C-alpha cells in the first residue's frame with residue numbers, strides 16, 4: 001500500500017511581513033499535522049483533505065471560514081470544493097455566509113445530495129436542514145480584514161492527500177478577494193479550476209488570481225501535463241507558465257501524483273505550503289526558505 | 297479570412313415524440329439562422345453565440361430562459377456562461393432569477409466587471425445596476441413545466457468567426473426538481489463550455505453532475521490538441537463520461553480550422569449547424585438533413 005502524503009497551502013500572496021510569517025508557519029504546521037494524523041489513523045484521502053482545510057477555516061490568520069476577506073458590503077461570502085479521486089465524486093458551495101466550515105458543507109453536498117454544487121440561499125437551506133449552525137454574524141470578520149476593506153474601498157486555502165489505497169483528494173476554501181462584488185465566485189468551487197482529483201493521475205489544489213485560474217482551468221491543466229509524462233514539477237511549471245503568459249494571472253498550486261510525487265510551486269510572490277510524508281514535515285513561504293523537521 | 301460557422305444544440309436528453317420534433321426543429325433553425333446572420337453581417341463569434349442562445353432562451357420550448365424546468369419548489373433558476381477564445385475572457389451566472397435572458401447577463405459580467413462568475417443574490421443585484429428588467433417569474437413558468445414537475449435539456453452554441461475567433465455560449469434551467477440553488481456544469485468553464493482560438497470551442501449538454509466531474513469541454517479539446525479529429529475527440533470524452541462516471545449527454549465542437557461536430561450518448565440531441573450557405577439539422581443519431589439557408 002502507498003505511503004500517505006498530505007500537502008497544504010495558504011494563499012498565493014505578495015510579500016508577507018515578518019510577523020504574519022510566524023503565525024502562518026504554525027497555521028500551516030497545524031493543518032498539515034491534522035491531515036497527516038488522519039491518514040496515520042488509516043483515514044481516507046478525502047477525510048485528510050477535509051481535516052486540513054477545517055483547521056485553516058478556523059485559524060483566523062487564513063482567508064477562509066473565520067478570517068475570510070470582506071466583500072463590497074463588508075460581509076463574509078465563502079466558496080469551497082472537495083473532490084474524491086476514486087470515482088470523481090465531488091461537492092462544492094459558492095457564496096455561503098454565516099457558517100464556520102464551508103468545506104464540510106461541500107462534503108455534505110457530495111455525500112448526502114444528488115448534486116455536486118449548491119449556491120447562496122439553497123446552500124444556506126441545505127446547511128440549515130443538515131443541522132449546520134448559523135453563527136451570530138460578527139464572529140467571521142477579523143479586525144485585520146476590516147482595515148483591509150476600508151483601504152481598498154490573503155488568499156484561498158487548499159489540501160491534497162494520498163491515502164494507503166492510492167486514493168487522492170483535494171479540498172479548497174476561500175472567502176475570495178477583498179471588496180469583491182457581492183455574489184462573485186472564484187475558482188474554488190469550480191471543478192477543474194480550483195482543484196481536480198483523479199486516482200489515475202493525482203490531485204491538485206490551487207491559489208492566486210481566481211478568474212485567471214478559471215480561464216485556464218489550472219488544476220486540470222496541470223494534470224494534463226502529468227498524463228503526458230511530465231514530472232509534478234514540470235507540469236506545475238508549465239501550467240503556471242501558461243496562466244502567466246496567456247491571461248497575465250499569478251498564483252500557485254500543490255499537486256501530488258498517483259505515484260507519491262508532490263511539489264508546491266507558485267508565480268505569486270509568496271505561498272505558505274506544508275507537506276507531511278514519512279513523518280517529516282516540509283514547510284516554506286518564499287522559495288528556498290524550506291525547512292524539514294521530524295513529525296512525531 | 298475564415299469561412300464562419302455556428303453550431304447549436306438543445307438538450308442531450310431522452311426520446312422526443314414525432315408530434316413535438318417539428319417544433320424543436322423550428323427552434324433549432326431559428327437559433328442557427330440568428331447566429332449565422334450575425335456572423336455574415338460582420339459580427340463576432342461571441343456576438344453570434346449570445347444571439348443564438350438568447351433565441352432558445354426566448355423560445356418557451358427549450359430548457360433555458362422561458363420554459364426552464366422547475367426546481368423542487370416550483371421555481372425557475374438559471375445557469376449561463378459565455379467565453380471568448382482570443383483572450384479566454386469569460387462571463388457566467390448561476391441561480392439567476394426573474395430575468396428573461398441569463399446569457400445576456402453572462403456577457404455583461406465578462407464585459408462590465410473585473411469578475412467572470414456571479415451567482416444568485418449578487419447577480420440579481422448586478423442585473424439591476426445594469427438595467428436588466430425584473431420580469432414575472434411565472435412568465436418563465438410554462439404549464440408543462442408546472443405539470444412535469446408534478447409528475448429536454450441544456451442548450452448552446454459554438455461559432456468560428458470570419459477573423460478566426462471561437463466562442464461558446466451555454467444556458468440552462470438545469471434538471472427537473474433540483475434542490476434550491478443547485479448549480480450544474482453550465483456556468484463552470486471547462487465543463488459547461490470552453491473556447492480557445494488556439495484549439496477550438498465546445499459546448500456541452502446532458503446530466504450536469506457528470507459533465508462537471510470529467511471537465512467534458514476542456515477534455516474534448518485536450519484530445520483535439522493530441523491530433524484526434526473533432527468526431528474522434530468527441531467520442532473519447534463522451535465515451536469516458538459514460539465509462540468513468542456513468543453519465544450521458546452531448547456536445548458541439550468547432551475547431552480552429554473550421555471542422556465541426558454534433559455528438560451525443562443520450563437518445564436525442566437537437567442540433568443545427570450553419571456554414572457555406574447551408575443548414576444542417578438532426579435530433580436522432582443518423583437522420584441528418586442538409587438544406588439551403590434562406
Ligand code: NA
Pocket residue numbers: 056057058059060061062063064065066067068
Ligand atoms: Na480562517
Ligand code: NA
Pocket residue numbers: 352353354355356357358359360361362363364
Ligand atoms: Na427557452
